[model samples]
Target: TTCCPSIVARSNFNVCRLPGTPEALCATYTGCIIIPGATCPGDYAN
Candidate 1:
């Protein structure tokens, strides 16, 4: 029910926060990516 959840991360970027937020915008520098209309704690359907 949200655009960005407090999602978890991998590699050296393991911090959960509301991605795409004003302060926490998404970017390659942060290593946090999100698929639109996706859920948190995801497995990417790989």
Candidate 2:
């Protein structure tokens, strides 16, 4: 998994999307993606 900051910015339901944060609830309402690219529990890198 790549340490791409953009991935965190664009991801959901994780430390990046801390509770009470901006759009953090979006994951809850819209449901969580629950995984990153390549499906490894890490940041996207493409």
Candidate 3:
């Protein structure tokens, strides 16, 4: 398996990042508020 899978999670704040060696902003959560990624800056669950 890879390092971190694309885990579905809720953003603790109003912003977060996507999954990558050097991550990017979550384009998947544009309107629904679903942060699709492997890592975030806060504590929460999918």
Residue range 1-46, candidate 1, lDDT tens digits: 1232223423223333334333234334344555555564443321
- Candidate 3: the clashing residue pairs are none
lDDT of candidate 2? 0.41
> Which rank order by TM-score, best down to worst?
1, 2, 3
Better of 1 and 2 by lDDT: 2
Tell me the whole-model lDDT of each prediction, alpha carbons only.
0.37, 0.41, 0.31
Candidate 1: deviation at residue 45, Å? 15
Task: Give, for candidate 2, the lowest lDDT window spanning 10 residues.
Answer: 1-10
Better of 2 and 3 by TM-score: 2
Per-residue C-alpha lDDT of model 3 across residues 1-46, encoded as one tens digit per residue: 0122224333412244433311223433322233456554333323
Per-residue CA lDDT of candidate 2, range 1-46, in tens?
2223344444543564565654435444434433345453433332
lDDT at 13, model 3 = 22
Q: After superposition, how far is residue 20 of candidate 1 from its true place, in Å?
A: 10
Q: Measure candidate 2: CA RMSD.
A: 7.4
RMSD of each: 6.9, 7.4, 10.6
Q: Distance from true position, residue 13, model 3, in Å?
A: 10
